[PDB]
CSV table of C-alpha atoms and ligand atoms in Angstrom, one decimal:
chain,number,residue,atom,x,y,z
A,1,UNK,CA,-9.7,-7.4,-1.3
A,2,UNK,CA,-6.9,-5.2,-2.5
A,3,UNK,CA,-7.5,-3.0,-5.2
A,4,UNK,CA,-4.5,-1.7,-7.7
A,5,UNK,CA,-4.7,1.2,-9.5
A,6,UNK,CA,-3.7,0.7,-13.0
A,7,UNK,CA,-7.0,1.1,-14.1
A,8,UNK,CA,-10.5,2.2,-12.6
A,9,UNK,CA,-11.4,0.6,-9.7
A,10,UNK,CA,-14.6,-0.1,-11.1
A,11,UNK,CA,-16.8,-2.9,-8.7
A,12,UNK,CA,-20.0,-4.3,-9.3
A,13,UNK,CA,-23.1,-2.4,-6.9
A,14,UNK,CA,-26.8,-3.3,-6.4
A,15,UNK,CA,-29.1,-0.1,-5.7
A,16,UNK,CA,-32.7,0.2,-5.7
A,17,UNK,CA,-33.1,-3.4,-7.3
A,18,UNK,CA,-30.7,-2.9,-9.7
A,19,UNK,CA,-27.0,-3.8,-10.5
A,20,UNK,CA,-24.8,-1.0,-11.5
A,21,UNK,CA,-21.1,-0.9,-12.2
A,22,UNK,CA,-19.6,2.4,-10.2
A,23,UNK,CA,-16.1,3.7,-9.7
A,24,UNK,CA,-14.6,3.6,-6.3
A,25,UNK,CA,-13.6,7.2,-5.9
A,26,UNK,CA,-11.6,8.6,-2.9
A,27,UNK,CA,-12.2,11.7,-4.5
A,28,UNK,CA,-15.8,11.9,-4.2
A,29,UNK,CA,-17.1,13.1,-0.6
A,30,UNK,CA,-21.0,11.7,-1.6
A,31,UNK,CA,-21.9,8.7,-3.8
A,32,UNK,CA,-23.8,10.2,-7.1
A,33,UNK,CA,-25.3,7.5,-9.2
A,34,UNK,CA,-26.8,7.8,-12.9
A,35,UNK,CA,-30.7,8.6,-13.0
A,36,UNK,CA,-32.5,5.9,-11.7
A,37,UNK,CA,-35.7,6.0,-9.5
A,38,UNK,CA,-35.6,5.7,-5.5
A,39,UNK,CA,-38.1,4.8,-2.9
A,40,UNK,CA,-38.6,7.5,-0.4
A,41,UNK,CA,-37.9,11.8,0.1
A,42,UNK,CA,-35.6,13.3,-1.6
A,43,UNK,CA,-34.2,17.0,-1.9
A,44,UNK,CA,-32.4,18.6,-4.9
A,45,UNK,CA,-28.6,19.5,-4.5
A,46,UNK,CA,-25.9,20.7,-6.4
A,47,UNK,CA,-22.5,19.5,-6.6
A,48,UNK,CA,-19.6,20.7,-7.9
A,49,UNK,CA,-15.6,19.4,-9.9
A,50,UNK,CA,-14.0,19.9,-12.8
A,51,UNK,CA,-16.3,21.5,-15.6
A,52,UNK,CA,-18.7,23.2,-13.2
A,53,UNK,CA,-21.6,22.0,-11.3
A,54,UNK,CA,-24.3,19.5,-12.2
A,55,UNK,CA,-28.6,19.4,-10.1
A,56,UNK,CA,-29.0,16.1,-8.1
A,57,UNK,CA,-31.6,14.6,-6.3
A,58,UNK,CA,-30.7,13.7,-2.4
A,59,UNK,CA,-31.9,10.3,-1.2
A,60,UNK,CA,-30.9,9.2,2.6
A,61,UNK,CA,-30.9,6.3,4.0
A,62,UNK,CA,-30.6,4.4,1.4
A,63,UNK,CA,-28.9,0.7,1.4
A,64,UNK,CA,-26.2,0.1,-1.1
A,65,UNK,CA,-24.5,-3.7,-1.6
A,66,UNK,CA,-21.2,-2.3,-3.0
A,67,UNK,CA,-18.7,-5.5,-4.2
A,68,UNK,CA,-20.8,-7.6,-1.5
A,69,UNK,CA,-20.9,-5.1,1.2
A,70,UNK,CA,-23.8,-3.7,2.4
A,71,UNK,CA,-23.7,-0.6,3.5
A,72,UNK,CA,-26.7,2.4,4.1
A,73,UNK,CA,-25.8,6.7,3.5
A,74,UNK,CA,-27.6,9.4,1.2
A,75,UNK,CA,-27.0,8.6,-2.6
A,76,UNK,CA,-27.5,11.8,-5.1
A,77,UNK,CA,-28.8,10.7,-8.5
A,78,UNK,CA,-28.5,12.8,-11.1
A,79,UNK,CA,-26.8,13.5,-15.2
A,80,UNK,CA,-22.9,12.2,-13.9
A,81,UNK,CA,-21.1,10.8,-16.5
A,82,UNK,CA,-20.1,7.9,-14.5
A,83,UNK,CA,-21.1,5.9,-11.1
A,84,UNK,CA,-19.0,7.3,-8.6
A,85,UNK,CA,-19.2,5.4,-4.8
A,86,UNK,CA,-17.7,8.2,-2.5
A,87,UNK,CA,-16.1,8.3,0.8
A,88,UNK,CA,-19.7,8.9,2.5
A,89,UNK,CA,-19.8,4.9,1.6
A,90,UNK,CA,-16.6,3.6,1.4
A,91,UNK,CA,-16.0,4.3,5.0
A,92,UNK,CA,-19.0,2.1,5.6
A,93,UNK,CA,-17.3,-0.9,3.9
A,94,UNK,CA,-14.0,-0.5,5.5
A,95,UNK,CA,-12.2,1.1,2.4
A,96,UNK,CA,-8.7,2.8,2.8
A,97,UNK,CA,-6.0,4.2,0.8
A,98,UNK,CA,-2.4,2.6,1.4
A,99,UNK,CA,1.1,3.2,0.3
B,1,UNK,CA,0.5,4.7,5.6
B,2,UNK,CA,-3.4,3.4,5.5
B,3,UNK,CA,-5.4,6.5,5.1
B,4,UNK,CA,-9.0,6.1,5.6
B,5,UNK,CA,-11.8,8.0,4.5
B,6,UNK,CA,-13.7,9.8,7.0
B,7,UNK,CA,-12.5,12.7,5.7
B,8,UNK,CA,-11.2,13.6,2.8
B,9,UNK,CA,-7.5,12.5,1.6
B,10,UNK,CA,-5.2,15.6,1.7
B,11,UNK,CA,-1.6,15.3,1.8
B,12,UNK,CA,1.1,17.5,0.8
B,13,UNK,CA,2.7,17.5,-2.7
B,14,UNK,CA,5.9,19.3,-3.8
B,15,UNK,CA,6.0,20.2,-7.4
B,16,UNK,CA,8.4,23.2,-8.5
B,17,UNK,CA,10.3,23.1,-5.1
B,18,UNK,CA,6.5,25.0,-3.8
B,19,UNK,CA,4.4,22.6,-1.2
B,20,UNK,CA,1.0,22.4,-2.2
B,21,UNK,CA,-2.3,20.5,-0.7
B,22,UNK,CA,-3.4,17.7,-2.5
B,23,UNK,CA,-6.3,15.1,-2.7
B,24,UNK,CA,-5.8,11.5,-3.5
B,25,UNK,CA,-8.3,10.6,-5.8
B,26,UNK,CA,-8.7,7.3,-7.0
B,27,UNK,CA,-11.9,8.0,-9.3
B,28,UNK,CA,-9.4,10.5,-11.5
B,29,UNK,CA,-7.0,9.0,-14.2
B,30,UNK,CA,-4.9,11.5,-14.4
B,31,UNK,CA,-3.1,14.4,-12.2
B,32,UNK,CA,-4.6,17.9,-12.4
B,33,UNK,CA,-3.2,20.9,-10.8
B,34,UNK,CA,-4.0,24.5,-10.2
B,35,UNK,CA,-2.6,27.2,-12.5
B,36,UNK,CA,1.1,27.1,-11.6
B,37,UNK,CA,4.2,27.2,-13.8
B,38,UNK,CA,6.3,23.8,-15.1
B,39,UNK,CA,9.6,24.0,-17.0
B,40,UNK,CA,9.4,22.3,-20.8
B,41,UNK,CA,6.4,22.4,-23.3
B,42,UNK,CA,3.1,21.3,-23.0
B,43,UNK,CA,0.6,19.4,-25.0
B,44,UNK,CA,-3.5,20.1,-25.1
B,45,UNK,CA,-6.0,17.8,-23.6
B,46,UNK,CA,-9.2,18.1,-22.5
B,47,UNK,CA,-10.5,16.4,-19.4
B,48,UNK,CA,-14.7,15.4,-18.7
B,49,UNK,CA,-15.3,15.8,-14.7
B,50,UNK,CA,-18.7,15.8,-12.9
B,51,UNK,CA,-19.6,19.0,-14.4
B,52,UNK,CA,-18.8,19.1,-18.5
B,53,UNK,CA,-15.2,19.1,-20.0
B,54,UNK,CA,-12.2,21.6,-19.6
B,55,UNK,CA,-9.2,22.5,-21.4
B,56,UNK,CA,-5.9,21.5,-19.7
B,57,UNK,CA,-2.1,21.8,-20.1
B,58,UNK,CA,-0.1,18.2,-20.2
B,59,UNK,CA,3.3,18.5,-18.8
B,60,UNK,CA,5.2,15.1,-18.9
B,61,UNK,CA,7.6,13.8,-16.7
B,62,UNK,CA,7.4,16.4,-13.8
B,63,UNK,CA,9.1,15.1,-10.8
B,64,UNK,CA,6.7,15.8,-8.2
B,65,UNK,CA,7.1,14.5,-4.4
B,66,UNK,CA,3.4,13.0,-3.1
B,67,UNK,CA,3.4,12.6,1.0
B,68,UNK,CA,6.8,12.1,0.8
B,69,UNK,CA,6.8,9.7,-2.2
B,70,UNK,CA,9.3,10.6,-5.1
B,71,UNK,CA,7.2,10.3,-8.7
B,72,UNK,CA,8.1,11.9,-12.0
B,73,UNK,CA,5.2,11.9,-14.7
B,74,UNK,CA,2.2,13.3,-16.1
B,75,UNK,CA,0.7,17.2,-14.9
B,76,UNK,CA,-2.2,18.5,-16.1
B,77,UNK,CA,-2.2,21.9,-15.1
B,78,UNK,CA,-5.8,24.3,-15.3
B,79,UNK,CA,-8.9,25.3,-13.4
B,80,UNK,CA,-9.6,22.3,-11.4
B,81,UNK,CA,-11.6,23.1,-8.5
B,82,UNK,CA,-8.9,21.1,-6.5
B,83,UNK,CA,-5.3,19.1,-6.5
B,84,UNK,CA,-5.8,16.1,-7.8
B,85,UNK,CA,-3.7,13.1,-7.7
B,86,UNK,CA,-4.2,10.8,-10.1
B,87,UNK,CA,-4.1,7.0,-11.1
B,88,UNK,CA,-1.1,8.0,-12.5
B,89,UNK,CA,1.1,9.0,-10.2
B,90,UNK,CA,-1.2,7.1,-7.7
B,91,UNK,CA,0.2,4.1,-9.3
B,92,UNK,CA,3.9,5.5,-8.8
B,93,UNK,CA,4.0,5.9,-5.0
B,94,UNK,CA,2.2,1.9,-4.9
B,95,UNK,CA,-1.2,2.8,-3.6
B,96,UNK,CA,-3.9,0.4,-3.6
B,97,UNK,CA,-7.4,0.4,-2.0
B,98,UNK,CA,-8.0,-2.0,0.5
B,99,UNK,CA,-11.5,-3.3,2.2
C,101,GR5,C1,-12.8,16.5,-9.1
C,101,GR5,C2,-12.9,15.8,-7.7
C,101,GR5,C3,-12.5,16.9,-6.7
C,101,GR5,C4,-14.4,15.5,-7.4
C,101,GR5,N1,-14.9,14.5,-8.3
C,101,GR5,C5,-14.5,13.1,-8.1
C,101,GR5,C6,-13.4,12.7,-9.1
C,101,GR5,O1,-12.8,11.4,-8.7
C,101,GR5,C7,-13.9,12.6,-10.5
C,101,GR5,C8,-14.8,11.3,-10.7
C,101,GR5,C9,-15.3,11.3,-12.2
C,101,GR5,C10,-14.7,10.4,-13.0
C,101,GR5,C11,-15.1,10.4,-14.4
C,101,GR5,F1,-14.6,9.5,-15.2
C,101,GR5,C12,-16.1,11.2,-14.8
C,101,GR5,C13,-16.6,12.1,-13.9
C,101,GR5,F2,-17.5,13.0,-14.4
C,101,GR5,C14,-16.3,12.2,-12.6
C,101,GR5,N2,-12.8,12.6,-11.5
C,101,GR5,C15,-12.7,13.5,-12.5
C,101,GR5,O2,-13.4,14.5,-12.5
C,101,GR5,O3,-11.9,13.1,-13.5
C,101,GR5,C16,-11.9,13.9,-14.6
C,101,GR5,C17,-10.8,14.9,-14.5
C,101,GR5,C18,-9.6,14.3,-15.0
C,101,GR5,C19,-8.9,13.4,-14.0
C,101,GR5,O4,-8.3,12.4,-14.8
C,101,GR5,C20,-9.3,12.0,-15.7
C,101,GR5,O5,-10.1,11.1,-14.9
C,101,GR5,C21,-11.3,10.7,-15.5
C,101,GR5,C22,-12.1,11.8,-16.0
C,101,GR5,C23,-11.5,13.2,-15.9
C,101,GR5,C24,-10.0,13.2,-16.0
C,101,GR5,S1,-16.4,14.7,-8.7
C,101,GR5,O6,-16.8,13.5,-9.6
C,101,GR5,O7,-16.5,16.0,-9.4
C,101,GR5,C25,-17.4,14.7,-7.3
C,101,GR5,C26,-18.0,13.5,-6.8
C,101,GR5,C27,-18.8,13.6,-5.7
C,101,GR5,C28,-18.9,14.8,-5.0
C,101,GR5,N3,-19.6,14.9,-3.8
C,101,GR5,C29,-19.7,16.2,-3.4
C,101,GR5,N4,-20.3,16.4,-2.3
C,101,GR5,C30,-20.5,17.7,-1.6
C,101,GR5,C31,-19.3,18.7,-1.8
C,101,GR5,C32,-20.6,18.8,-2.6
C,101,GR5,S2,-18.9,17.2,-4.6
C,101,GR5,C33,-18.4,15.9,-5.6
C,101,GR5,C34,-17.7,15.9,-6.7
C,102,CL,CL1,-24.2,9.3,4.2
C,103,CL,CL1,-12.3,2.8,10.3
C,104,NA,NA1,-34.8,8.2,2.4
């Protein structure tokens, strides 16, 4: 599919059981989801962008159906104030920018 | 060009005749630059990013060259962590995402 830009690309994801609606987000090196529970080890992190820095917890390996694609990377869950899928994912599914 | 995402989506921007590095960023609505100065007056807004909300400087219709790609628009000018190119101007150089 192709994506335009007048508003957020917003797509439909399943994670850990559970639908989700996240924001495709070239901007975002690592895919940071709202809390949720995981299966498996997880480490904290922190992450940083506009207004500071915000604790996550790391999960790896974790698979991610994102708009129909499947795809497996680490997913950070923690207090963002929206879904973000990053480029950790969105390579996996083939995403690019053009112009 | 198609641009993917392996690493992250610099290109160079010219705003106020200066080249600057910046990151295309679909996941932002709107253009946000480092301290720099723009010609005309501004108007306050205040933008919510990963981290908690900042105070920012609007300048509108800046003509701003993105990768080669003439735009004139919206500038939000403060202490983003990065350069950030918007939706907005996003939009004016006719990028889409693709997968
Ligand atoms: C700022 C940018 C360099 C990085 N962000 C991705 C952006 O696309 C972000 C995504 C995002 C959207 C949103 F709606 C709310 C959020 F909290 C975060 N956009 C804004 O901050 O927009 C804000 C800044 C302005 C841009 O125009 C408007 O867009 C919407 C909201 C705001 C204004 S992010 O969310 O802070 C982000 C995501 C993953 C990520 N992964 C990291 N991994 C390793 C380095 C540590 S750091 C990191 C930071
Ligand atoms: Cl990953
Ligand atoms: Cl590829
Ligand atoms: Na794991």
């Amino acid at each position: 599919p192709q994506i335009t830009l007048w508003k957020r690309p917003l797509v439909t994801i399943k994670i850990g059981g559970q639908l989700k609606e996240a924001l495709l987000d070239t901007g975002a090196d690592d895919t940071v989801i709202e809390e949720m529970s995981l299966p498996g080890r997880w480490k904290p992190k922190m992450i940083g962008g506009i207004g500071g820095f915000i604790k996550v917890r790391q999960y790896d390996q974790i698979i991610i159906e994102i708009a129909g694609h499947k795809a497996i990377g680490t997913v950070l869950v923690g207090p963002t104030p929206v879904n973000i899928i990053g480029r950790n994912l969105l390579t996996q599914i083939g995403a690019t920018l053009n112009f």
